[PDB]
Nucleic acid binder design. Structure first.
Lengths: 217, 76, 62, 31, 187, 76, 148
RNA sequence: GUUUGACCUCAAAUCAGGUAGGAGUACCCGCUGAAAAGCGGAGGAAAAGAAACCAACCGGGAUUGCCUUAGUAACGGCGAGUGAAGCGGCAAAAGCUCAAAUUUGAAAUCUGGUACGGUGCCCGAGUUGUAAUUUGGAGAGGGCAACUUGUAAAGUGCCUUCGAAGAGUCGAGUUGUUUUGCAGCUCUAAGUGGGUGGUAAAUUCCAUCUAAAGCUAA
């Protein structure tokens, strides 16, 4: 398959380097310039139809703190929306190694992803996203570049490693599911995990508690 | 209250801009884009337009405007 | 409506097993043993160490 | 290259003026 | 001098390089006799000078002076009109039965729209050659435009026939060569 | 000092609190039966960018303007 | 009024006509000095919306600057050169790969027309002397970044 | 017509009238800038200043300064420590002017000179636009009605028709700098547009202003 990476007008440099590293990870992915609208999403399908890509990624950066992502097949029903948390960039010494950019990726599920059907969808569509055909450049050498996914309670910890035996090499993801809806980017909402709470609701709870305290005071 | 700048496009305005774009001609990237349309389709036309521009909405706007030019020129 | 459109998406998933370990994957049976006080990243990295070593054995074999 | 310019919109002639300004009083009475 | 050199160097590079067809619509201008009769027509419709205006004003004020004053009503004046935004104003009405456009204007973009504007509006525009002469017929140094709307009955037939004439000499002759790129020949 | 509107406060900490404002509106002074421009010469503050959205605040400041009009004697 | 047509014809700059005018006027100014006087504004619509009036006491200078901000520096050039004049504002007219060309509007506070006509007497006050030096012009405020 | 004259442009003035420098610089405003110095520019103050604002409310309403917000939010080998802002109380309170459509039934505008700040006369400047009127809070045209203050100016009720605005700019890529902004190079729009910010029971909603021009005491 061919893939696209799209970002929004929200920009923070620690947030930005993540997209660069991800683009370096997948060669079939692209680094098209960021879109204006965080609300209009159907046009992206046309972009995919213009770029001939079977899965497209859109990153929404709201308020320069909140990170959501969609990954979806652009002529096609599956659409899953995720929340992003606890990120780390290439600069620090957690990592201590680089790789030739484009070796075939190995992958791992530290979870059943069978009993829960929506998690099985997230599983298969992630395999789609990170499945790299032979067309990837610099794929002749195998760098032992591997990724793993781990639902802790409901948050997938997504991680990357290389051999030394092992050393971690790539970005650290604490990712959360939000919802699943039909169509390429529109079709009606089908599934939603109620356990997730957006940080907007959290600030609302804090502000409401402050208002109640002031009223009692 | 909504500013009168918000209301709509006056007839004088559409007239004026049509007359300006007539007398101006077509820029070399536009002179390119017409031939790229006629040769390799609106898909590649849109791709090249967006590469020239920054965003995609301006790209579709440009391609639609230039299709209007092509249609109103060749048939009339 | 959930499971039905989920099966719809399963059908829309074009992941055939025509080519084995070209996705190059190993799937785990159990979850990571993550005690909240323990440094759960390090509780992870040992288990994925195990599973990637398993995948390396699988790739070297086939 | 160079090509001649097409006159595709000039050839259409509008039969009315652009703006319907009401005529002022002062144009008909001595100043 | 520097500026004699510049002005002699000016008009060489413009013909050296290809002028856009929106330009060179200029200098494809009215012929000798037709401009001559256009100016003979206009010289009957000179505007009142400030001096003549003040003479008539003091005359009529003195007429009001008398005890035994005199009160009368007088007809409309007749004259060409010449101010640029005013000239465009009489267009888009329309009121200009004729418009003359000088070719030599240092900010030519002040005037590039006027030919196309009057073409689409159907005003019988003509490109006269020399803004200074427009200034002469209007009590100004320069005008760059000369519009006329209202004409007495004693010249109306002359106006209409001159309109047909300019339609014959300018619109017919030069529309196809208004329609090409000019210049481009080295000097 | 120039007389001012009694105005409602924003936010939730002081949603219950009432304040002195800048100026009433054009609409309110028209409801007073006088013009804003003339109302300036009398010493009444006026704010154009403000909007009246609460009925009770409006009515209270209207009665306030009535009593202001009552207590003032203007010299010719 | 015709000035609208000037505005929207200026809107399409890279068009054939205005690029041709750019390319002739850039050369014609190139023959001229770094700084010199223009008889009339080449973009009268821009001059008006920046505050121009065609009467005694309004001076037009064309300034050439090599590629602080370039517009602000260009304003400062005429600020030093014409000390008696007070800089009103400037605007862009033309450019080259070697130089950028700007047109600056200066006002004389000594001519009685400016001293009268209370619309513009405000610039006669000594506090407005060398606005460009203190960044009180349009580009000065933009570079300082003073807004709400 | 080899003449003469209209312009435009440019020079020259021991031609008329004005204007700049320099000192100081406690405070103020810009540029530069280390381990502050320096440069440029005033004034009695200066700057800023009447929202392309703040907010999510039962909304506020130029700017400026004080208390609080608060050593909080946020930032930081999240180490050294750095470090706000809405709102609220108070002081003082001020709003205005352009640029967009014609006065065309008369450039109505103004510098200068001269004879007695004003008046006359004359040169000029100016239509490549000076005056009057209109800055979105609308406003314009008329008609009717009355009022209120020389066929003078202005305010209000109703009918009809009109009802014009900041582009090498917004934005985007990249480079340098800065803590998001700024500066450079390539590119460059739109008008029931555009910018910013929330929002889904998502082929979403409604929320709020109008940049790319300018003045203004305390």
């Amino acid at each position: 398959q061919r893939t696209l990476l799209i970002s929004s007008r929200g920009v923070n440099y620690r947030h930005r380097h993540l997209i660069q590293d991800l683009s370096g990870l997948l060669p079939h992915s692209r680094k098209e310039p960021k879109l204006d609208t965080k609300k209009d999403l159907q046009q992206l399908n046309e972009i995919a139809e213009l770029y001939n890509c079977n899965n497209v990624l859109f990153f929404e950066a709201r308020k320069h703190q909140d990170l959501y992502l969609w990954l979806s097949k652009p002529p096609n029903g599956p659409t899953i929306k995720f929340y992003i948390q606890n990120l780390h960039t290439m600069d620090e010494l957690n990592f201590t190694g680089n790789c030739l950019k484009g070796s075939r990726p190995v992958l791992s599920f530290d979870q059943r992803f069978e009993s829960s059907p929506h998690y099985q969808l997230i599983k298969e569509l992630l395999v789609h996203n990170f499945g790299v055909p032979p067309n990837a450049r610099k794929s002749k050498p195998f760098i032992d570049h591997v990724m793993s996914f781990s639902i802790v309670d409901d948050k997938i910890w997504v991680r990357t490693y290389e051999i030394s035996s092992l050393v971690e090499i790539g970005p650290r993801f604490v990712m959360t599911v939000i919802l699943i809806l039909e169509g390429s980017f529109g079709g009606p909402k089908i599934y939603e995990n109620k356990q997730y709470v957006s940080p907007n609701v959290v600030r609302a709870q804090i502000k409401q508690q402050a208002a109640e305290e002031a009223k009692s005071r | 209250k909504i500013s009168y700048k918000k209301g709509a496009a006056s007839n004088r305005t559409k007239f004026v801009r049509s007359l300006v774009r007539e007398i101006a001609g077509l820029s070399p990237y536009e002179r390119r884009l017409i031939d790229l349309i006629r040769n390799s389709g609106e898909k590649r036309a849109r791709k090249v337009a967006k590469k020239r521009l920054g965003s995609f909405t301006r790209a579709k706007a440009k391609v639609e405007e230039m299709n209007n030019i092509i249609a109103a020129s060749r048939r009339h | 409506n959930n499971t039905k459109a989920m099966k719809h998406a399963l059908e829309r998933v074009q992941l055939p097993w025509k080519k084995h370990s070209f996705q190059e994957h190993q799937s785990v049976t159990s979850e990571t043993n993550t005690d909240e006080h323990i440094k759960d990243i390090y509780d992870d990295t040992e288990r994925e160490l195990a599973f990637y070593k398993q995948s390396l054995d699988a790739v070297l074999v086939a | 290259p160079y090509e001649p310019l097409i006159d595709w919109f000039t050839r259409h002639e509008e039969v009315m003026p652009l703006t319907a300004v009401p005529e002022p009083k002062r144009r008909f009475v001595p100043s | 001098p520097e500026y004699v050199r510049v002005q002699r160097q000016k008009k060489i590079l413009s013909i050296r390089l290809k002028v856009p067809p929106t330009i060179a619509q200029f200098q494809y201008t009215l012929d000798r006799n037709t401009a001559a009769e256009t100016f003979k027509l206009f010289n009957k419709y000179r505007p009142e000078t400030a001096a003549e205006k003040k003479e008539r004003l003091t005359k009529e004020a003195a007429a009001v002076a008398e005890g035994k004053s005199k009160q009368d009503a007088s007809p409309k004046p007749y004259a060409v009109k010449y101010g640029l935004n005013h000239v465009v104003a009489l267009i888009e009405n329309k009121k200009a039965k004729l418009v003359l456009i000088a070719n030599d204007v240092d900010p030519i973009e002040l005037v590039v729209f006027l030919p196309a504007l009057c073409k689409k509006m159907g005003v019988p525009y003509a490109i006269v050659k020399g803004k200074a002469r427009l200034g002469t017929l209007v009590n100004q140094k320069t005008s760059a435009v000369a519009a006329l709307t209202e004409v007495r009955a004693e010249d109306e037939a002359a106006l209409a026939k001159l309109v047909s004439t300019i339609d014959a000499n300018f619109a017919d002759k030069y529309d196809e060569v208004k329609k090409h790129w000019g210049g481009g020949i080295l000097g | 000092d120039l007389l001012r509107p009694v105005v409602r406060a924003p936010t939730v900490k002081y949603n219950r609190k009432v304040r002195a404002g800048r100026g009433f509106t054009l609409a309110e002074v028209k409801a007073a039966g006088l013009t804003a421009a003339y109302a300036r010469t009398i010493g009444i503050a006026v704010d154009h960018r403000r909007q009246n959205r609460n009925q009770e605040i409006f009515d209270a400041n209207v009665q306030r303007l009535k009593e202001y009009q009552s207590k003032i004697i203007v010299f010719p | 009024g015709a000035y609208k047509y000037l505005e929207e014809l200026q809107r399409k700059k890279q068009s054939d006509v205005l690029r041709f005018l750019q390319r002739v006027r850039v050369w014609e100014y190139r023959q001229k000095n770094v700084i010199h006087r223009a008889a009339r504004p080449t973009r009268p619509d821009k001059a008006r919306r920046l505050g121009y009036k065609a009467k005694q006491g309004f001076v037009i200078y064309r300034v050439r600057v090599r590629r602080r901000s370039l517009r602000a520096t260009a304003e400062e050039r005429v600020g030093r050169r014409a000390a008696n004049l007070r800089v009103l504002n400037s605007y862009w007219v033309n450019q080259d790969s070697t130089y950028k060309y700007f047109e600056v509007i200066l006002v004389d506070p000594q001519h009685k027309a400016i001293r009268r006509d209370a619309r513009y007497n405000w610039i006669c006050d000594p506090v407005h002397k060398h606005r460009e030096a203190r960044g009180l012009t349009a580009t000065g405020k933009k570079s300082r970044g003073i807004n709400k």
